[PDB]
């Protein structure tokens, strides 16, 4: 197949993952623009290939305005191309760094959209496993712009509230206690990560952090976080409450996305 190289012109870099690069591209026949996630595949093992197919398959199964849309999946000689609709506002990560933190209003709006994209995965039997601000993209730079869930590279399927050992994977600061404890897990891990994200939205830094990654994981497994003054003095108890429910160490006790979209701090507006 040369199906990509002669149907698309590649443009500039939009971002980078662990071993992928995402470039803007333009379909030649139409002049329509897309984001091409490019993976060098001569490097890859059989398992990795399967993960790529799984990523494509799961993306397609999801249709939501807050989930990125996969337009094509093309395998060439030394490269695989996943062509997605272009989301032009950059990563949520960049916006938080750019603004330092979101007001309680903006943060509420933002986490509402994230939780909606997550709950959509969950009701469709998918756990993403890698919720973080780098994998959430903004429809544009404008306050309250639409947030889109990206990066289904680690996503897997699980039914309902079932939990099994799906392996050690995710992003360190966002990893849940049950993954770190190597206990069986399920959809609940994404809510933990959303709890981390919401804390980040509110003060601009994460609740779990250490230069020593061993201590980091220990802090996470213990659920050891606080709300340091003065950053958190202005923040309402109602918001802190929601973070606390999302950051509940025992996944069985943990709030679900469905009943998180009910929380007063998100709804009482």
């Amino acid at each position: 197949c040369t199906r990509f190289s002669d149907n698309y012109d590649i443009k500039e870099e939009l971002g980078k993952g662990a071993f992928s690069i995402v470039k803007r591209c333009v379909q030649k026949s139409t002049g329509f623009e897309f984001a091409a996630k490019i993976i060098n595949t001569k490097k890859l093992t059989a398992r990795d290939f399967q993960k790529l197919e799984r990523e494509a398959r799961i993306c397609r199964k999801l249709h939501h305005p807050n989930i990125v849309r996969l337009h094509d999946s093309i395998q060439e000689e030394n490269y695989h191309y996943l062509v997605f609709d272009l989301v032009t506002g950059g990563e949520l990560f960049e916006d938080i760094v750019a603004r330092e933190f979101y007001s309680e209003a903006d943060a509420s709006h933002c986490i509402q959209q994230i939780l909606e994209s997550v709950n959509h995965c969950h009701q469709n039997g998918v756990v993403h496993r890698d919720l973080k601000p780098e994998n959430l993209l903004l429809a544009s730079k404008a306050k309250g712009a639409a947030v889109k869930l990206a990066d289904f590279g680690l996503a897997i399927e699980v039914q309902g509230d079932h939990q099994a050992w799906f392996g050690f994977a995710g992003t360190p600061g966002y990893l849940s206690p049950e993954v770190l404890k190597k206990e069986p897990y399920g959809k609940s891990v994404d809510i933990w990560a959303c709890g981390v994200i919401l804390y980040i939205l509110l003060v601009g830094y994460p609740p779990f952090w250490d230069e020593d990654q061993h201590r980091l994981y220990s802090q996470i497994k213990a659920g050891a976080y606080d709300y340091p003054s003065p950053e958190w003095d202005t923040v309402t108890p109602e918001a802190k409450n929601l973070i606390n429910q999302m950051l509940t160490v025992n996944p069985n006790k943990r709030i679900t996305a469905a009943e998180a979209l009910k929380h007063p701090w998100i709804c009482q507006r």
Binding site: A18, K51, Y205
Partner: peptide, 15 residues
């Protein structure tokens, strides 16, 4: 503690 990028890991081990 500060907001910095973090790379995704996958050490597998699924059973």
């Amino acid at each position: 503690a500060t907001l910095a990028r973090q790379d995704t890991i996958d050490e597998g081990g699924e059973v």
